C-alpha cells in the first residue's frame, strides 16, 4: 500500500494499556500465582505469551475470570514478566534470573528465555 | 531502574492485537457508523482515541456492547482510522483526507489530525 506510519504509535498504545492496568480499568482476568493475585487484560496476555494465547482461545477457558498458575511458578518472576508484557522493560537481575527464565519458559515467551540463556552463559 | 528493553515488543503486541481483531477473538464492542459495523477491543480504542477513552471510562457506557457514532461520521474514514489504531499505518489519500481528518477530530486522535492538516496545507 501507500500508507504513512506513526513511529511512536505502538509504544503509545502499550503505555496507555499499562495506565489502564495500573488503574484496574477494563481488566477482565485475575492470574493467581500461589498466594498472589495479578489483574490483567486477556488480550495483552495472549499477545505476549504462547501459554495465555492457548488458554484464552480455548472455548471453555476464554470465559474464566480466574486462572491459577502451576504452584512451582514464582510470584516475583511472574510480576517481572507481567511488567515486561505491559512495558517492553525486563527487570533482569542476578537474584531473579533463574525464576524469570523458568517463568518465561512456562509462559512461552521465547525472546525473554533467549536473553536469560545469554545472560546465564556470560556468567559461567 | 536497571531494566533491559526489547525494541520490537510494542510492535509485536500490536501485530497480535490486530490478528485477534481479524479473527474476532475477545472483541467486546461493535462500533456502528451509519449502515456499517466494526468489531473491536475497548482497550485498544481507549488507548488510541480521546473520545473512546472518555466513553469507556464512563460508569454506564463502559458496559455497553454497541456504540453508535454521530451520523455525520463517514464509515470509510472510521475504517481507515480503526486500521491505523491496530497497525500504526494510515491510508491517507487525496480522495479520503477530508473524511479522515473530520473523523480523527471527532475521535480525538491529535497526531492524525496534525498530519492531515500538514498534507492539506502542502496542496494549497
Amino acid at each position: 500500500d501507500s500508507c504513512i506510519q506513526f513511529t511512536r504509535h505502538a509504544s503509545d498504545v502499550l503505555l496507555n494499556l499499562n495506565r489502564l492496568r495500573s488503574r484496574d480499568i477494563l481488566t477482565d482476568v485475575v492470574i493467581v500465582v500461589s498466594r498472589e493475585q495479578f489483574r490483567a487484560h486477556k488480550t495483552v496476555l495472549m499477545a505476549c505469551s504462547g501459554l495465555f494465547y492457548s488458554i484464552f482461545t480455548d472455548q471453555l477457558k476464554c470465559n474464566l475470570s480466574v486462572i491459577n498458575l502451576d504452584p512451582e511458578i514464582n510470584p516475583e518472576g511472574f510480576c517481572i514478566l507481567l511488567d515486561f508484557m505491559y512495558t517492553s522493560r525486563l527487570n533482569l537481575r542476578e537474584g531473579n534470573i533463574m525464576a524469570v527464565m523458568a517463568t518465561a519458559m512456562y509462559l512461552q515467551m521465547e525472546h525473554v528465555v533467549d536473553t536469560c540463556r545469554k545472560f546465564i552463559k556470560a556468567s559461567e | 531502574d536497571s531494566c533491559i528493553q526489547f525494541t520490537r515488543h510494542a510492535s509485536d503486541v500490536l501485530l497480535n492485537l490486530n490478528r485477534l481483531r481479524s479473527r474476532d477473538i475477545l472483541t467486546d464492542v461493535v462500533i456502528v457508523v451509519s449502515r456499517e459495523q466494526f468489531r473491536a477491543h475497548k482497550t485498544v480504542l481507549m488507548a488510541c482515541s480521546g473520545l473512546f477513552y472518555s466513553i469507556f471510562t464512563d460508569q454506564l457506557k463502559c458496559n455497553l456492547s454497541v456504540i453508535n457514532l454521530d451520523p455525520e461520521i463517514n464509515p470509510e474514514g472510521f475504517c481507515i482510522l480503526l486500521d491505523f489504531m491496530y497497525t500504526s499505518r494510515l491510508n491517507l489519500r487525496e480522495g479520503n483526507i477530508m473524511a479522515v481528518m473530520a473523523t480523527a477530530m471527532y475521535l480525538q486522535m491529535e497526531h492524525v489530525v496534525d498530519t492531515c492538516r500538514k498534507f492539506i496545507k502542502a496542496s494549497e
Binding site: 500508507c3 504513512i4 506510519q5 506513526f6 513511529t7 | 499505518r89 494510515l90 497526531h111 498530519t115
Partner: peptide, 4 residues
C-alpha cells in the same frame, strides 16, 4: 510520521 514516516514512509514505512
Amino acid at each position: 510520521w514516516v514512509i514505512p
